[PDB]
Amino acid sequence: PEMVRGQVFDVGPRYTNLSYIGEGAYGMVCSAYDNVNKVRVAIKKISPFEHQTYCQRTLREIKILLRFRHENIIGINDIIRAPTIEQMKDVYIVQDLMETDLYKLLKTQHLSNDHICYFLYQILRGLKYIHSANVLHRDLKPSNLLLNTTCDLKICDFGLARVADPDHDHTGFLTEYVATRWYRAPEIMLNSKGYTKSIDIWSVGCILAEMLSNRPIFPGKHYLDQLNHILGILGSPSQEDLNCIINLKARNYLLSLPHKNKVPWNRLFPNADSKALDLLDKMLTFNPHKRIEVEQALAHPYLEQYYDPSDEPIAEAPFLDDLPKEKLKELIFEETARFQPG
Numbered sequence: 001p002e003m004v005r006g007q008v009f010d011v012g013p014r015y016t017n018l019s020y021i022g023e024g025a026y027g028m029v030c031s032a033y034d035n036v037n038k039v040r041v042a043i044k045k046i047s048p049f050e051h052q053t054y055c056q057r058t059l060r061e062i063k064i065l066l067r068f069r070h071e072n073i074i075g076i077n078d079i080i081r082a083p084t085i086e087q088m089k090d091v092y093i094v095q096d097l098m099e100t101d102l103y104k105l106l107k108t109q110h111l112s113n114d115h116i117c118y119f120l121y122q123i124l125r126g127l128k129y130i131h132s133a134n135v136l137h138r139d140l141k142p143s144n145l146l147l148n149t150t151c152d153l154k155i156c157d158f159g160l161a162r163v164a165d166p167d168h169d170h171t172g173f174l175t176e177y178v179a180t181r182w183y184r185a186p187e188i189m190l191n192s193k194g195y196t197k198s199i200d201i202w203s204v205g206c207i208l209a210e211m212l213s214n215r216p217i218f219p220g221k222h223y224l225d226q227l228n229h230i231l232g233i234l235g236s237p238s239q240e241d242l243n244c245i246i247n248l249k250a251r252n253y254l255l256s257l258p259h260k261n262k263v264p265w266n267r268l269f270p271n272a273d274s275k276a277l278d279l280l281d282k283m284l285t286f287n288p289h290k291r292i293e294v295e296q297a298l299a300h301p302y303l304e305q306y307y308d309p310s311d312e313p314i315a316e317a318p319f320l321d322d323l324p325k326e327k328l329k330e331l332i333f334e335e336t337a338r339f340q341p342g
């Protein structure tokens with residue numbers, strides 16, 4: 001087997017001429033030439049079976065990506081694993097190869113307003129599909145937005161996704177860790193389990209702000225800092241919004257804060273398009289019930305050059321994993337069976 005920076009990649013005979021792309025807690029990702037379709041693909045080696053949480057992310061991603069088909073959502077083209085459960089130690093997920101991600105891109109490149117507009121369109125177009133399937137991505141962030149050399153955008157990593165469950169969204173104060181901290185909506189820290197579509201809209205708002213300035217808008221240095229950053233810009237919630245928060249610990253925390261005025265978007269983003277800032281405001285609304293929804297956002301004047309509901313497709317139909325890691329391995333085995341010869 002070919003070796004890539006220490007690891008084996010058991011992907012042959014079909015996939016050859018491997019080259020390192022990246023590493024992380026997920027595993028390792030390479031490009032590789034596909035000897036069938038004669039195109040270079042990405043392959044990620046995932047080794048989840050000792051960790052229930054890794055098994056959950058792997059199963060969720062596989063189940064979701066196999067069902068979804070959309071231009072702005074990364075696919076799974078093939079999955080390589082051992083022929084038996086006993087011999088299966090790794091799962092390789094083969095996906096379309098992309099040049100970079102928005103996190104890498106924002107570290108190095110100034111985006112024109114036209115690029116910002118086009119990227120936000122593709123994010124929302126993809127999200128319209130995801131939400132139309134009653135699915136929440138729940139970890140939207142620049143590193144989960146893949147880009148090719150012509151700036152086509154694809155959402156990736158569906159391992160943290162859930163089916164939407166808005167009647168069971170309420171929880172207590174400083175409970176929850178939904179999303180990656182900088183992209184996590186205020187209600188997560190206050191009273192929300194992140195089981196509504198408005199969680200994803202918040203993250204998109206944070207992405208938009210970051211495209212405007214190449215700097216995260218709410219860079220909390222740790223968990224507790226995150227609400228400080230958000231309220232620092234948005235200001236004190238209104239009486240109406242506060243009254244929606246019935247949990248006393250959360251309400252009284254907010255009431256204990258000194259009055260803070262809203263920092264106007266045009267001062268944080270003096271070079272930004274005024275329409276972009278109007279949409280940004282509506283995505284970064286404190287009250288999730290008042291927050292713009294994905295189809296309204298697509299309809300916003302900022303995106304008028306692209307908006308076309310007939311070309312913004314929805315899923316054909318809507319889409320208990322409190323299970324031990326051994327059971328999750330079986331379900332991963334069954335879910336990947338269709339890519340074996342048989």
Ligand SMILES: COc1cc(F)cc([C@@H](CO)NC(=O)[C@@H](C)N2Cc3ccc(-c4nc(Nc5cnn(C)n5)ncc4Cl)cc3C2=O)c1
Pocket residue numbers: 021022024025026027029042044046047048053054055057058061074095096097098099100101146156157158159160
């Ligand atoms: C503890 O964490 C995890 C444990 C798990 F058991 C499983 C996971 C899974 C599911 O939750 N999560 C991921 O696999 C996420 C984290 N990533 C990483 C990743 C890297 C590259 C590409 C990629 N990259 C490119 N091109 C590219 C990138 N950079 N360059 C210069 N080129 N093309 C095509 C592709 Cl699929 C996609 C992804 C992706 O989805 C996480």
